[PDB]
Design a protein around this ligand. Structure first.
Ligand SMILES: Cc1cc(C)cc(Oc2c(CSCc3ccco3)c(C)[nH]c(=O)c2I)c1
Ligand SMILES: OC[C@H]1O[C@@](CO)(O[C@H]2O[C@H](CO)[C@@H](O)[C@H](O)[C@H]2O)[C@@H](O)[C@@H]1O
Ligand SMILES: OC[C@H]1O[C@@](CO)(O[C@H]2O[C@H](CO)[C@@H](O)[C@H](O)[C@H]2O)[C@@H](O)[C@@H]1O
Ligand SMILES: [Mn+2]
Lengths: 552, 426
């Protein structure tokens, strides 16, 4: 820890100045612990006693390490962090296991004293000043300032990362073969070389890092495969998620649930069939982390299925750039889809689910297309290309649905997989009026205060009908009048409404809805042989429409 | 001497901090190459972690030399560096441009690369070539010269442009020359051959006395608009509202007609549906055929009349922005309206290409957007804000697959209501 690496210039935000937080003295031993820690640091160059001049100050403290012979210095830069300039945000994302490529040997190197090994911009040191209190309210206390990246400062992560990158730049160019992943203070070195030649290069890298003030592990690696990494378990030829453990409770809190779902979604990367619709449906209502929540019948029926799936262990495989990417998707049940991405029969790179409706009402095609989109984005992120899709829908089905759809959609090349349940259109509306079909003029109306309503129809055959409705809305009665017409008509019917709202819902051909009434209308539409739905401007003297408007 | 022009951001505004979109390994490899060279050439420089800004970069093809090209999305930076340069009283957009027989668009973006960029401003032009699967942190760079795509580039080069074009304009007083960002729009009423000849004199003039470089988009291969980018605005149509011509009308036909006419009434005051509705009196089967009355056509035919001459009492206001809505019409056809206030269309139009070999909705929409934007620039001097009838995610995934322009408009995503009916054709 004495790196000759050029420093990164740093600045306090515009207008602001150093922090002047007073140190509140403490324990006899705690001050002694600091002096001993700081004297050892001073010897190492990590910090330097500053003159009586002017450095500002940041509170210091000292803690019992989780081992009791050694104590730990601790600085609370919260105030400095606030006055310090923004930095290029360090990698918020993380490399996904199914994106790594097969390697014969992989070594893990931990940099030691990572931060304390990189120098701090000379001009910025003065703002890191701190003081360890005195014997006890007597002597002034000693003033110190950092000369290296302080363990809790804002710029330490990014500056360290960039310095590491620069240090590795020459080595990675003299070894286009070796791959190195940087993550925090860890370095994962992999290669397709003979265990003896590999171990060779590793020692090389080590000496290189060492000549730049970076110390790596002694047995050359305190690396023992499988590596437990970020909720993952990586083996030389496969990867999985670390031991998932679902808690059994009697009273579940909002907090208990969120934690459950989170873990479930994490299992979802490799465990096929995980579902979290109902457990989530039952969640964000309001944000009490502690407001106990009564477990729904479905939520428990869902939680049960999840437990069974998690019973037998599953693993994922690594990426082979040679072979290509394939994605398969299968419908599940009720707005739920699951998928897997692979290269070889029986070897999953990873799995996933798609349970987003994107609206009150939808249909399988439109949801299927969205699932394709999410996967495509994920594939590009993880592998850098799009996969070949295998979908439970025939070219005709999809072909029909979009030539008609008012929106623009697109799907990379795909293949029809005949493995029910297949995606399909349960009903299609006529594009022209039927001839020997009774024509129903429907209308619905509601009182905005009493919320009482009416729904009815008048047909050309002379039939009229009105039905009373309770606790309803204008829009709700409009859908109900249509439902009414469908119920009283034959296998073929022409329906005329003045509701753009009800038009828009049905003309979008939905096969499932969050609305109970819409699902009933849908059930009726499927029963029907031919249904032609039409719209006309309300209160415009259109015969048929005027008569029924006055009725309701 | 490095004569850089002091540039600053809008008061009380900080640089852009936009996230880089993940890119295909293919596009990443292209960017790495292009940047490695720009770096060797001194146009850009690697930056450190003390720079926190970011602007999205993309990799496109100007239609296939099988070359790649970098496209920086400075939409955010432009909005913070400039609606204040001297953004309102230099040479605003000329009006005869949309009346010329031929307007050729030439890319003069390579000029900028010569002028060094202001020291204190560079930091604000930082971008990131992404890594695949977060394997390594992205490669970060910032510009050392005026970047193509930034709205301050043309403004800072302005003086130099007007100086180079002087002689040329002094000898061709009947050629309008309008600049918009990275492009020059040259219009005339000459004959195609002369017009084209004259464009060639301009190119060579920029080349030799500019020691500026306009690319030579040699003439057509496939049948339509290929040399520079050859427009013919004097031939731009308007897609008026059309009412069906009928053999036999059914109750359902008149109902649809009354609905459309009713809707139109919010634009054309003269439209009337009185004598037309009377034929619907009574609750009849939609099929029932009904003879148009005598007063009907006296009303219908009168409507077709009003619906021919685009409305008036609609003026372009430069303080408000233009809005373009597009609707999928099927069969590779697309309609659109440019406006500023609902029901006050400055223009209406259509766009279509259905059966060449290779086309899909995204590609179509992508070309329609570039077509509308170009017409928009020619007619008003600015690009509009688009209300795209596609899903955000999808558009974001594929638009760069067919984008060829050097500029990028604002856009938002919408869900078109069944009024496509009130706009469709034949
Ligand atoms: C802790 C850790 C994290 C990551 C993201 C990669 C890594 O080593 C790897 C691994 C996996 S680590 C386990 C392993 C690989 C071989 C033996 O054991 C793979 C598949 N491919 C590589 O290119 C590298 I570098 C090791
Ligand atoms: O070509 C894939 C083909 O093999 C099957 C089994 O017949 O799928 C196997 O491999 C998948 C991933 O590699 C697993 O998700 C699946 O559970 C396993 O049976 C077929 O389903 C598939 O068509
Ligand atoms: O594509 C939408 C997406 O792009 C971002 C940048 O990542 O913003 C850009 O597009 C917006 C809409 O056109 C502009 O308002 C903005 O100037 C531009 O950067 C995202 O903000 C937006 O979600
Ligand atoms: Mn009504």
């Amino acid at each position: 820890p004495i790196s000759p690496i050029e420093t990164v210039p740093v600045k306090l935000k515009p207008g602001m100045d150093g922090p002047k937080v007073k140190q509140w003295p403490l324990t006899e031993e705690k001050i002694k612990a600091l002096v001993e820690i700081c004297t050892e640091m001073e010897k190492e160059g990590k910090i330097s006693k500053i003159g009586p001049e002017n450095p500002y100050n940041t509170p210091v403290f000292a803690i019992k390490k989780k081992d009791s012979t050694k104590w730990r210095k601790l600085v609370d830069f919260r105030e400095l962090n606030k006055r310090t300039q923004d930095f290029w945000e360090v990698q918020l994302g993380i490399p996904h296991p199914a994106g790594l490529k097969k390697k014969k040997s992989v070594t893990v190197l931990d940099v030691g004293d990572a931060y304390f090994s990189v120098p701090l911009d000379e001009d910025f040191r003065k703002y890191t000043a701190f003081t360890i209190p005195s014997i006890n309210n007597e002597t002034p206390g000693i003033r110190y300032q950092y000369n290296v990246l302080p363990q809790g400062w804002k710029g330490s992560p990014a500056i360290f990362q960039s310095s590491m990158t620069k240090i590795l730049e020459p080595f990675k160019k003299q070894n286009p073969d070796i791959v190195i992943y940087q993550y925090m203070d860890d370095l994962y070195v992999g290669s397709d070389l003979e265990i003896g030649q590999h171990r060779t290069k590793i020692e090389e890298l080590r000496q290189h890092l060492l000549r730049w003030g970076l110390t790596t592990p002694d047995k050359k690696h305190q690396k023992e495969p499988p590596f437990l990494w970020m909720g993952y378990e990586l083996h030389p030829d496969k990867w999985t998620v670390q031991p998932i453990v679902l808690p059994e409770k009697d009273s579940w809190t909002v907090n208990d649930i969120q934690k459950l779902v989170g873990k479930l979604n994490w299992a979802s990367q490799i465990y096929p069939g995980i579902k979290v619709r109902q457990l989530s449906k039952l969640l964000r209502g309001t944000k009490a982390l502690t407001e106990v929540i009564p477990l729904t019948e479905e939520a428990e029926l869902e939680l049960a299925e999840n437990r069974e799936i998690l019973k037998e262990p599953v693993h994922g495989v690594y990426y082979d750039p040679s072979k290509d990417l394939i994605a398969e998707i299968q419908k599940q049940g009720q707005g739920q889809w699951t998928y897997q991405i692979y290269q070889e029969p029986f070897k999953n790179l990873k799995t996933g689910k798609y349970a987003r409706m994107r609206g009150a009402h939808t249909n399988d095609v439109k949801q299927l297309t969205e699932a394709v989109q999410k996967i495509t984005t994920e594939s590009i992120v993880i592998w850098g290309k799009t996969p070949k899709f295998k979908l439970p829908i025939q070219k005709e089905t999809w072909e029909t649905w979009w030539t008609e759809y008012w929106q623009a959609t697109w799907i990379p090349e795909w293949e029809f997989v005949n493995t029910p349940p297949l995606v399909k259109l349960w009903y299609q509306l006529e594009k022209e009026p039927i001839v020997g079909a009774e024509t129903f003029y429907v209308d619905g109306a509601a009182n905005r205060e009493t919320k009482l309503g009416k729904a009815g129809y008048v047909t050309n055959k002379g039939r009229q009908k009105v039905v009373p409705l309770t606790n309803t809305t204008n829009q709700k009665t409009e859908l109900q009048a249509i439902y009414l017409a469908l119920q009283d008509s034959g296998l073929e019917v022409n329906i005329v409404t003045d509701s753009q709202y009800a038009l828009g819902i049905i003309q979008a051909q939905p096969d499932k809805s969050e609305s109970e009434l819409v699902n009933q209308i849908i059930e009726q539409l499927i029963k029907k042989e031919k249904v032609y739905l039409a719209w006309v401007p309300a209160h415009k003297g259109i015969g048929g429409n005027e008569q029924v408007d006055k009725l309701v | 001497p490095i004569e850089t022009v002091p540039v600053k951001l809008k008061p009380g505004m900080d640089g852009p901090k936009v996230k880089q979109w993940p890119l295909t390994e293919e596009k990443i490899k292209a960017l790495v190459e292009i940047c490695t060279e720009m770096e060797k050439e001194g146009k850009i420089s690697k930056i450190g972690p003390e720079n926190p800004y970011n602007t999205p970069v993309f990799a496109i093809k100007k239609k296939d030399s099988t070359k790649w090209r970098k496209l920086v999305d400075f939409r955010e930076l432009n909005k913070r560096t400039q609606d204040f340069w001297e953004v309102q009283l230099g040479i605003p957009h000329p009006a005869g441009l949309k009346k010329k027989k031929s307007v050729t668009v030439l890319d003069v973006g390579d000029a900028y690369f010569s002028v060094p960029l202001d020291e204190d401003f560079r930091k604000y032009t930082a971008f990131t070539i992404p890594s695949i699967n977060n394997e390594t942190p992205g490669i970060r760079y910032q510009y050392n010269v005026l970047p193509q795509g930034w709205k301050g580039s043309p403004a800072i080069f302005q003086s130099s442009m007007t100086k180079i074009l002087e002689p040329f304009k002094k000898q061709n007083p009947d050629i309008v020359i309008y600049q918009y960002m990275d492009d020059l729009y040259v219009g005339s009423d000459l004959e195609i051959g002369q017009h084209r000849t004259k464009i060639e004199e301009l190119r060579q003039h920029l080349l030799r006395w500019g020691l500026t470089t306009p690319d030579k988009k040699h003439q057509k291969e496939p049948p339509f608009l290929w040399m520079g980018y050859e427009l013919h605005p004097d031939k731009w149509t308007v897609q008026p509202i059309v009412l069906p011509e009928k053999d036999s009308w059914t109750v359902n036909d008149i109902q649809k007609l009354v609905g459309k006419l009713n809707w139109a009434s919010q634009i054309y005051p003269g439209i009337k549906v009185r004598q037309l509705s009377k034929l619907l009196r009574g609750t009849k089967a939609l099929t029932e055929v009904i003879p148009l009355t005598e007063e009907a056509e006296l009303e219908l035919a009168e409507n077709r009349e009003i619906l021919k001459e685009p409305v008036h009492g609609v003026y372009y206001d430069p303080s408000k922005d233009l809005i373009a809505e597009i609707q999928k019409q099927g069969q590779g056809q697309w309609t659109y309206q440019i406006y500023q206030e609902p029901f006050k269309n400055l223009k209406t139009g259509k766009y279509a290409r259905m059966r060449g070999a290779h086309t899909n909705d995204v590609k179509q929409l992508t070309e329609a957007v570039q077509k509308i934007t170009t017409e928009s620039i020619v007619i008003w001097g600015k690009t509009p804000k688009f209300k795209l009838p596609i899903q955000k995610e999808t558009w974001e995934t594929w638009w760069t697959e067919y984008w060829q322009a050097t500029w990028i408009p604002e856009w938002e995503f919408v869900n078109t209501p069944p009024l496509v009916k009130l706009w469709y054709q034949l």
